[PDB]
Amino acid sequence: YDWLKTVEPTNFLKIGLPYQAHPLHLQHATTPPSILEKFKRADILLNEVKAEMDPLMLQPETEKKLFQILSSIDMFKGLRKKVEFTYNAQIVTNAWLKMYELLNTMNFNNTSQAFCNCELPGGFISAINHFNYTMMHYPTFNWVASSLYPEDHYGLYQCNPDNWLMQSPLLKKYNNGDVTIASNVKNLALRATQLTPIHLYTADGGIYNKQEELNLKLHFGQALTGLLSLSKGGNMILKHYTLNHAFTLSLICVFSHFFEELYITKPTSSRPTNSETYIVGKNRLRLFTPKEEQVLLKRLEFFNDTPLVDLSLYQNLLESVYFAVETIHLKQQIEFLNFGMKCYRHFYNKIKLLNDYLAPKKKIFQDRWRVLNKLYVLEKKHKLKLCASH
Numbered sequence: 580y581d582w583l584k585t586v587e588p589t590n591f592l593k594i595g596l597p598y599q600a601h602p603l604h605l606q607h608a609t610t611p612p613s614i615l616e617k618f619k620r621a622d623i624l625l626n627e628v629k630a631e632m633d634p635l636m637l638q639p640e641t642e643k644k645l646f647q648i649l650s651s652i653d654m655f656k657g658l659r660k661k662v663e664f665t666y667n668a669q670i671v672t673n674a675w676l677k678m679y680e681l682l683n684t685m686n687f688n689n690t691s692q693a694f695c696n697c698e699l700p701g702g703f704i705s706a707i708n709h710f711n712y713t714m715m716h717y718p719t720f721n722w723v724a725s726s727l728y729p730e731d732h733y734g735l736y737q738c739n740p741d742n743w744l745m746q747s748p749l750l751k752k753y754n755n756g757d758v759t760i761a762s763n764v765k766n767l768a769l770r771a772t773q774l775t776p777i778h779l780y781t782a783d784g785g786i787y788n789k790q791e792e793l794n795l796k797l798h799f800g801q802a803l804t805g806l807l808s809l810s811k812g813g814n815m816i817l818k819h820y821t822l823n824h825a826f827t828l829s830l831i832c833v834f835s836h837f838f839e840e841l842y843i844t845k846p847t848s849s850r851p852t853n854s855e856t857y858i859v860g861k862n863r864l865r866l867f868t869p870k871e872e873q874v875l876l877k878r879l880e881f882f883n884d885t886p887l888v889d890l891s892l893y894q895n896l897l898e899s900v901y902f903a904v905e906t907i908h909l910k911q912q913i914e915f916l917n918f919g920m921k922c923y924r925h926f927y928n929k930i931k932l933l934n935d936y937l938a939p940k941k942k943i944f945q946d947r948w949r950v951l952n953k954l955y956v957l958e959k960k961h962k963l964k965l966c967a968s969h
């Protein structure tokens with residue numbers, strides 16, 4: 580009924596974090612500030628709403644109908660193919676859309692000398708290549724990349740060895756691109772810096788109750804690789820999830836010592852029903868000291884989830900991060916999860932009718948996106964060289 584015909588486009592969610600003027604102190608364990616119980620309450624609540632789907636997953640019939648309902652409520656379903664044909668875009672995965680929305684919204688000072696980590700399909704790379712040649716008009720776009728060795732579904736790794744920094748097992752002798760290994764992280768940055776200035780670092784790494792806890796070491800390494808290679812004034816983009824763990828918040832505290840601007844973003848192209856978030860750092864203020872490099876790389880070498888800094892020294896920032904969690908996860912994500920279950924209860928046996936109801940809105944939402952993130956045809960001379968088809 581009416582609850583389907585009033586659904587409006589979501590908005591790009593962007594929450595500014597304060598930079599910390601105090602000197603960074605990498606910790607060598609401490610008592611948490613009280614605001615961490617607020618974060619723990621948010622993790623319990625979000626997992627409660629996420630748990631509302633467990634009954635349907637037990638029988639393969641209802642599990643199927645659920646993933647169709649979720650498919651049906653994906654308001655951006657047909658957009659990737661529309662963007663690909665109309666504007667000659669390449670590797671138009673959902674990450675392409677997310678990267679393109681980020682570039683059009685965050686107003687970076689430079690997107691020209693890019694290091695994309697945990698990538699493989701050039702969704703982020705292709706989007707930056709597309710954005711640079713059609714919007715920024717850099718004379719040439721030079722980029723390096725890495726990823727855990729396959730997969731390369733579009734032949735971007737195979738057709739551009741010069742640009743990829745990981746190694747196939749034929750060279751086991753050797754950086755396989757695994758950023759959970761401290762030796763690899765330092766090597767990746769070193770090779771990357773051997774691209775002379777690096778202006779844009781991006782990492783889309785990712786592996787439900789413990790999704791953030793299971794990705795902590797991955798997201799730690801993907802951030803360390805950027806912070807070891809991003810030049811001053813450069814920009815950083817990192818894929819994350821719930822950001823409720825104390826280690827995660829301490830990592831954000833580190834970011835906030837090295838960047839002029841720091842934002843927790845949630846693009847509309849990112850599914851409103853998932854916890855995926857993007858930490859955007861702008862205008863790198865300074866580089867690591869040799870000590871900061873050693874402590875942090877050692878924390879990865881022998882990893883445990885003890886906070887990296889004294890969280891009690893970052894109350895302002897932690898309140899802003901909670902406001903992000905509240906806005907992105909506790910409000911938006913929970914509302915859409917609830918919305919998906921309402922659709923399931925009323926349309927599990929009427930998938931076609933729900934798709935009919937929402938087809939007009941899907942065009943409105945996608946037309947809005949294309950109006951907000953303006954696209955232009957990418958000339959063939961600037962297409963990335965690809966080795967495979969789909």
Ligand SMILES: Nc1ncnc2c1ncn2[C@@H]1O[C@H](C[C@@H](N)CC[C@H](N)C(=O)O)[C@@H](O)[C@H]1O
Nearest residue numbers: 674697698699700702703727756757758783784
């Ligand atoms: N430990 C790891 N080290 C490096 N890359 C990893 C690791 N774990 C997963 N990955 C890669 O991270 C990527 C995960 C995706 N979110 C990346 C998507 C990519 N940005 C795209 O355009 O489609 C995949 O390419 C994985 O192989």
